[PDB]
Every structure is written in C-alpha cells, then in structure tokens.
C-alpha cells in the first residue's frame, strides 16, 4: 500500500479548547489531593532509614533502567513493529514509574516510604540521564538527535507536585496530628467528585472512537509489557533476598510507567495526522495496566484472606 498518512485528524480547537485546560487543571488538583492524603499516612523515620539503605532503591533502578529498555527493544525487534510503534513502546519502557503506581502501593500497604523515595529517585534519574539511553537504544529510528525534544519543565513540575504535598503531610503529622479524619473525608469526597467529572468530560473530549483499528500484535505486546515488567520485578526482588512486604511495592512501581511524557514527546515529535490510532495508545495503555493491576489486587485478596 506504499506509504500514506492516516485519515485520522485532530480539530484545530484541540490546541486551545477551554475544556482541555479544565481537564489539565482538574487532573493537577486531583494529583495534588492524592499526594497530600497519601503522604498524610507517612512518617520520616522509615523514609530516612530507606534513604540510608539504597539497596531496594538500587535494585529498583537497575530493574527499571538497565533491563527494562533492553527487553522493550528486544520485544520491539521480535514483533516486527513499525518505526513509530517501536519508538512509542521504547519511550514507554524507558519512562519512569508512574504516580498512579503509588496509589496502587496504597493497595499493597507495604513499605510506603520506600515506594515514595524509590519513585522520586527514579524520576530524578530519568531527568538526569534518560536522553542518553533513549538515543543509544533508538539507533536506526528517528535519526534526529531528539535530545532537546524530551520535556524537562514537565519533569520538574511533576517532581514539585510529588514532593510538596508529601512534605507538607509529614510536617503536619509530625507537628500537629489532630485533624486526620476531616482532611481524609474531604479528600475522599473531592477525589470522587473529580473522578466523576473527568470520567464524564473525557468521553466527549476524546471523540473519534476508532481505537479498535489498531493491529492485534501491537495490542498484544502493549498488554504483555506490564505483565512482563511485573514478573521481572517480582523475580528480581525474590531472588535478591528481600522480605515480602518490601518487594510487592517495588515490583508494582517497576511494572507501572508514566505515559504523559510519552504523549508529549510523541505530539512534539510528529504531527497528529501522521500518527494514527497510536495517539490514543498511551492513554488507554495505562488504563489497561490499571485493570491488570486490579487482577493482581484480586490475587492479593486470594492470599491475605487464605
């Protein structure tokens, strides 16, 4: 069929819809409340002790950065994927641990301070040295340098939005821990309201429900990536002589990856008419692994009660 661009197109209003800005600000507010309420149940002693012992941090970074990009490249080469799809899956693989994974860590309820220090150190390491590995692993694809194409202001903004609410929570609990219940209830109700609002808004904001036109093997590998990541993290944690409570959160952090930076780099690198359904690939992909995480949650409820 030679080489032709996809018929999918984005309206010009997509650049500056007020609804897009509303969606961005409500997600920022949601994440701020998530992080505040999530750090409201954390203490400084455990995070200091885990910072003193970067053993789990070291193994987490080794699994996420020294192995995950390599296996992502291997799967991309094996699946005979196109240049755009291979670049997208490589960027997803080299992406650091997503914030939502910490939420899933709350479901794990094991060594939460280790989880937060691991994810912040992973984001710092990403900001420090992601472009070099991205350029090394993308030989023959996108011959451009791409070094300046990766976002930097977004990474530091995310780092601030992670550190500030957690630090505020630790300070408030250490000094004056007397208003836990009201803050928790308000956070929960506002979180539910914002979730309902975003669920209502995104359905009409996305549009063009042609996400099923994607080729089957790309969907298969997008589903396999979180599974293989979780399996590799669990195996590395178990074979390295780590206790069970301290390994589930590390495995879940390693398996989950952020997709916002991948979306931003995909949109800045390529026009939206050139990209077909892959523009909707990351937003669904994380959702997919969320469901996968839910399955793991069931497995947890198959072990804690039994």
């Amino acid at each position, epitope marked *: 069929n*030679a*080489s*032709a*661009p996809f018929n999918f197109t984005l309206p010009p209003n997509f650049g500056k819809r007020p609804t897009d800005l509303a969606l961005s600000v409500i997600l920022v507010f949601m994440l701020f409340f998530i992080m505040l309420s999530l750090g409201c149940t954390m203490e400084f002693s455990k995070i200091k002790a885990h910072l003193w012992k970067p053993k789990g941090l070291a193994i987490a970074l080794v699994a996420q950065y020294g192995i995950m990009p390599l296996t992502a490249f291997v799967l*991309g*080469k094996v699946f*005979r*994927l*196109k*240049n*755009i799809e*291979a*670049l997208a899956i490589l960027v997803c693989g080299c992406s650091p641990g997503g914030n939502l994974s910490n939420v899933f860590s709350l479901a794990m309820k094991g060594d939460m301070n280790l989880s937060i220090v691991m994810t912040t150190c992973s984001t710092f390491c990403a900001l420090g040295m992601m472009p070099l590995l991205l350029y090394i692993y993308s030989r*023959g*694809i*996108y*011959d*451009g340098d791409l070094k300046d*194409k990766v976002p930097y202001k977004g990474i530091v903004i995310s780092l601030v939005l992670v550190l500030i609410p957690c630090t505020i929570g630790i300070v408030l609990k250490s000094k004056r821990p007397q208003y836990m219940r009201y803050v928790i209830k308000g956070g929960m109700i506002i979180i539910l309201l914002c979730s309902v609002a975003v669920t209502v808004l995104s359905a009409i904001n996305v549009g063009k429900s042609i996400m099923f036109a994607m080729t089957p093997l790309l969907i298969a590998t997008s589903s396999l990536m979180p599974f293989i990541g979780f399996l590799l993290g669990y195996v590395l944690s178990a074979l390295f002589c780590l206790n069970g409570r301290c390994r589930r959160t590390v495995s879940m952090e390693t398996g989950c990856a952020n997709v916002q930076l991948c979306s931003t780099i995909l949109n*800045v*690198a*390529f*026009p939206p*008419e*050139v990209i077909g359904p892959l523009f909707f690939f990351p937003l669904l992909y994380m959702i997919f692994q969320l469901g996968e995480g839910l399955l793991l949650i069931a497995i947890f409820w198959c072990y804690e009660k039994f």
Partner: antibody
Amino acid sequence: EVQLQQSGPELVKPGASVKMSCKASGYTFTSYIIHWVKQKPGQGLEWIGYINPYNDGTKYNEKFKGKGTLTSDKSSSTAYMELSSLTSEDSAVYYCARSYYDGIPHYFDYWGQGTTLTVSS
Amino acid sequence: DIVMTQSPSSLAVSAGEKVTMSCKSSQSLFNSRTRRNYLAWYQQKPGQSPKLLIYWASTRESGVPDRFTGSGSGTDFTLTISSVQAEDLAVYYCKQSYYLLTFGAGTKLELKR
C-alpha cells in the same frame, strides 16, 4: 494531483546571498518532509539535506553541512534553501522532493521541475 | 557511510534485450525489524526531472508500465525492463535510504548500431 513549483533560474555573482524557494500546495504541508538534491552537469545526482516543517528540523549532508541552510514557512507552505557561499564551480541544478517520514525517509515520490543556479561574473 | 557503485554504467538495447542494472551498495542495507529492504529505483529522462519507478526494491509505483521489474535482497539488486521501448532511455541511480541518502553513479541507455 500535487505539483511542486520552483523559484526559477538564478544567475548570481560570486558574492553569494542566494535563496531558492520551493512551493507545494496540494496536501497538508506538515505531513511530509522536503529534500534538496543537487545535480552537476553530466555528473549525476547528489544529496544535500532534508527539512521537516512540523518541528522545523533540518538535517544536512557532511559536504553541505557548512553552507546548507533550510527554512520552512507554514503560512506560505514553502521551503527555502540558502548557501551563503558560492563559487564558479557551484553552478548546478537543484531539485526539491517530497517524501514521507515516519522514522526514516522512504522515497522521493514527487519532484520539482528544477532550479538552475549559475555563479559567474 | 554507504556508497553505491554500478558495474555496467552504460548499455544499449534495441527492442527486447535484457538490461539488468545492478548496484551492490556497500553493506547489507536490509532492516531486520521491518521487512522492507530500503531501496529506491528512479528514472531521469534527459531534460526532465527524475521520476520514481520502484520503491522498497520490490514494489513498483502505480501508473508505471508493468515492464519495469525489480528483484533483489541483501546487497544484490536487479532492475529489468525486458521489452525496452523508445521512451525507456534514461538514467537510473538506485538511490538508497537505509542510513544516509546517497545516489548511484548512474547508468545510461543507448541504441545499438
């Protein structure tokens, strides 16, 4: 279909300061990238470099890295190529070609009619 | 870098004599991940802009005569015309785009006397 229009024949002094414009308005100009090919009389084609207008990215050959310069105009949907360094031997024919670019330029499916650049006294 | 060298560089065919232009390139310009075999065969009539004939070295552009066939793999490629007409006299460069855009020396077609 789509056609590519060149600026036209150019006769310039060895004082440089020459610019070549290629126009193509038959599609979405940001969906494809534009290459420039230099041909000497009876010596075959020679590649110079390409430009992607969406990100305003430019890549040049090793020989043409020093002199080659590519710019794009989305409003005019045009590609401008400049050297700023010419010699008497530099006279040639320059073609602008349109190609798809996912990770690697595929092929030059459409070409312009060509611009004959001459440098002399 | 990759450089293209064409062995014959000049031949003459009257009506139906085999042509079989071949350029061996430099190394294996075959993508392992994507089975595309990056290569392009162009046609440049005198006093005219080059016209694309074959892309991916196996598939021909729509609208060209079926007499233009291209078969090859790895480093060995061959373009055959078979029934050569009076309008088929041009220059072919077998341009490659695996790593860098480089053009071949060019082969000229004439008429035997």
